[PDB]
Amino acid sequence: LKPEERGLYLIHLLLTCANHVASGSLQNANAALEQLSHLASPDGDTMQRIAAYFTEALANRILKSWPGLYKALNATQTRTNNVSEEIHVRRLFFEMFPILKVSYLLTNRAILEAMEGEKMVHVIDLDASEPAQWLALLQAFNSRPEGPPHLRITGVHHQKEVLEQMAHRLIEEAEKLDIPFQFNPVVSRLDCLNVEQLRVKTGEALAVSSVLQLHTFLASSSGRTDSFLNAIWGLSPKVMVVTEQDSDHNGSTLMERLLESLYTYAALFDCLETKVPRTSQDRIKVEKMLFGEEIKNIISCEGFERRERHEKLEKWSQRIDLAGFGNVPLSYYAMLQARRLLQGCGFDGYRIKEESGCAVICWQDRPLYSVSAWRCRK
């Protein structure tokens, strides 16, 4: 079986099986899944790896069609904590892809420019997982001509160990940088988060950073997102910076989301193929623990259980602008610095496109993520 004939046949199987899933024919879906199992492979080429995670996702969805069987398969629920591995895979994403470095650079510039002249700055991090985002902003605040303001950072995360490492690293750097700095952790999932927990004081300039968190609220195009954006609006932030996936993965039907997500993750899996060896354990961890989980959630989950409801930038702009925010175009030279970052080792093939004052991070011609800055209107 030719490798190129193997790849295209895998695509047909995915669409065919998905139709059998929608039709509900378990016999016809099982036969399609049997074929996928022998051809797909997490160690194979790009299409074999892509097929492996979409195949597992599709099989998980039809497993949910029998709730008794699905639950019984987890009756001995393996309640567990895998924090160290999850920190490790996030570090790999930060280092093997330029997405977060570009996002951090652009959002830190937008915050610094919003905090010109402010002596009291409070930054709210809705996903405080990587301390590299604020370590750079600490040095930049210290280097700014007017000297550093009093900096306060509120970190929100659902795991204490993640907040302990960030707090330790940020206090250690701020103590070296001689910056008056305060970090208060907030242990909470984002849905149960209340404004009162953020403990914002009066008279301090505020900035909100939402890295890949806004689409979470679209789960059961949403009313939960409106309430959260309005809650953020009431806090009167001087700037809100939003980093989101730039793909329509929130389509109504299974076939809709399968078609688009196949194109998006084919691009993401393509970067690793052109850069990292097939035998790399780092590559497999990222492909499984990150993209595989997102693919599985997009394909096999519904209702509130489907949190990876990615939408394009144009939808987010309307949604955020209707919530009372005005767009703050990213700095031309911040965009130039982000492009120079892409000239780094192993970042060729990426491109940054400007779209209505916002940045779109692309692989080849395929959009992947967007970065946008917003201020309160009225």
Partner: peptide
């Protein structure tokens, strides 16, 4: 034989 091009080749004939 990129995967992003395989999807393009299959979608045309399908």
């Amino acid at each position: 034989m990129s995967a992003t091009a395989l999807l393009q080749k299959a979608a045309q004939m399908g």
